[PDB]
Every structure is written in structure tokens, then in C-alpha cells.
């Protein structure tokens, strides 16, 4: 009778879950153009944790400067400078941007193959 429903089962992010969830957010227009922040991404990651069970350790991006590409193949959002373009990547303001080609092209792995061994 405890009135809180249990946490849904936990699992690591996969290509297909990232693809599926990217496309859902695209249909809803949920992230497109939104200024990135640590807190906003946390709300995003925790919403996926809560509704689907994915540990929030997957949504990482290449270090920049410039466009930041997703380390997780299948996630179809990248982060794009909205005030381009700076030398210090930590000063660049970014927005989420959907890119359909990220479903087929692992851009992060081509720019930074060292992350993948």
C-alpha cells in the first residue's frame, strides 16, 4: 500500500535507446535550440533515468572548441556555439541541435578515435 511506485529497472544506455529517445525529443521539439547548461542536461538525464532506467553517465560530448559531438553513438543531438566562436571552449555558449546524420555517422569516434579502444 506504499503509495510510491518503484524505480523502473536500471540499465546502461545503448545505441538504440539513444536513437529512440533522440527521435522522441525531436518529434516533441523538446531540446532543439535550447541553451545548454549543466543543470538543464541533468534534468534531461534524470528524466530518462526516472522514466526508462538509464544510468545518467552516457550524455557526454567531445571537448571542443566549436561543435561538441556525442560520445554515445545513436544520440542525435550535438552542442553548437550560439555566439561563435571562441578560443576557450569553457566560454562558448552552446545550444542543443538535432542532427539526423548522427544516427549513421559516429562523428566523435572519427574526430577522437582515442576515446574508443
Amino acid at each position: 500500500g506504499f503509495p510510491v511506485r518503484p524505480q523502473v529497472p536500471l540499465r546502461p544506455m545503448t545505441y538504440k535507446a539513444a536513437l529512440d529517445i533522440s527521435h522522441f525529443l525531436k518529434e516533441k521539439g523538446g531540446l532543439e535550440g535550447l541553451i545548454w547548461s549543466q543543470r538543464r542536461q541533468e534534468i534531461l538525464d534524470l528524466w530518462i533515468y526516472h522514466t526508462q532506467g538509464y544510468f545518467p553517465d552516457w550524455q557526454n560530448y567531445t571537448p571542443g572548441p566549436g561543435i561538441r559531438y556525442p560520445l554515445t553513438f545513436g544520440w542525435c543531438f550535438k552542442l553548437v556555439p550560439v555566439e561563435p566562436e571562441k578560443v576557450d571552449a569553457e566560454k562558448e555558449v552552446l545550444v542543443w541541435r538535432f542532427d539526423s546524420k548522427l544516427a549513421f555517422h559516429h562523428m566523435a569516434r572519427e574526430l577522437h578515435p582515442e576515446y574508443y579502444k
Partner: nanobody
Amino acid sequence: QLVESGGGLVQAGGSLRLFCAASGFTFGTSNMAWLRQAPGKRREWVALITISGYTDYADSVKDRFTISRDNAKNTVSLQMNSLKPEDTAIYFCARRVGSEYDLWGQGTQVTVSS
């Protein structure tokens, strides 16, 4: 060496196709890019073509520019449509390694008037 050509005088709304011939330097395992520099301003990334032929573009460049590569010739091209005066710049080709631009040419001048 990286030697770009194709630059010239363009009327607003016109098109231009740029071309780079690359020497050295192992080309087929190189991510390639086009950048541009206006006068006084800071260099701006324009387009990227990845080792496996995958592409990306700046915002200001949209569905106007198209970057392509041809592996038989150590060559990379940039098709530019619907040109505007703010596209005026020196355009150059570069090799991208990780987050940095390894090599780059002196470039070719594009001047768009209205």
C-alpha cells in the same frame, strides 16, 4: 602543401565552387575542413568532411554550402550557393585533428557584392 583555388568576384545571390589540392601528407586518413577569415575578424569554421566522407556545416552556411572529397586526387571541394556580402572572406582548406586544425593553406579570396 594545401593550395586552394576558385576565388573571384561574385554578385549577391550568385554561386562559386572552391577546390583544394593537397600535398604531403596522408590524405585518406585525414578529416578535412574549410574555414574562412574576413578582414580584422577571427577565422570561422565553415564545413567539415570526415575520414569516412561524413559532413557538417556552420549555422551561417546552412543549406547553401556543400563540402565534398575525391580520394583519387587528394582533393576537397566547396560548393557555395546563394552568396551574401557577409560571406566575403579568404577561404582556406585545413586538416582537422581532434579539436585542432593541423595543417592549413593560404586560401582563396571570395568577394561578394550587391
